Amino acid sequence: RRKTRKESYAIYVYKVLKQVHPDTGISSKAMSIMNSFVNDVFERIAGEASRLAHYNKRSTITSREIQTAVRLLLPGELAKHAVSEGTKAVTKYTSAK
Template sequence: MGFSRQEYWSGLPFPSPWNLPDPGIEPRVLRQMHTGLSLSHDSMNILDSFVKDMFERIAKEARRLACYKCCTITHEDIEIAVRLLLPGELRKYAITAATKSLIRYHTCR
């Protein structure tokens, strides 16, 4: 990439995840999914970096897709970005989880 994260995030209509406090979600998810396992601090930093990088890539692609239609990023833009960026099984799992979350969101609303 030819630009910094700060330059990239300054053009987006939502705040950068680097400016938000770190809630420490990963250890809680790990404890729920795999009791008895733990990750070292370095491993957690690598995992956190991976998640933030994928968020950046998906947001950038969704933004590019939304520029052709309107200035709002919709769930369809996010889904198309995920389809373009993630490989095979990870793509299927991400889309399934996102669909479940959308259904849950709309039923609770």
């Protein structure tokens, strides 16, 4: 019988690659590293957002916990540009209802 689903970020990493560099490809080793990078940054941000909710006696991780976790974890201009993109996305999503 066919093998079980292994879930991956690879198709979204490829969609983002096709936007920043439409003629560039990626090796499966480099895609595996990109998948590890996404999983690592997800776990860092969600873990700091988790600590932030607990410190403040809150049951909910919100867009606000994610924003503070991103400000804590990302250095310098990566934080400013990531916070810009996160706020733009939640604004567009809220307007779409």
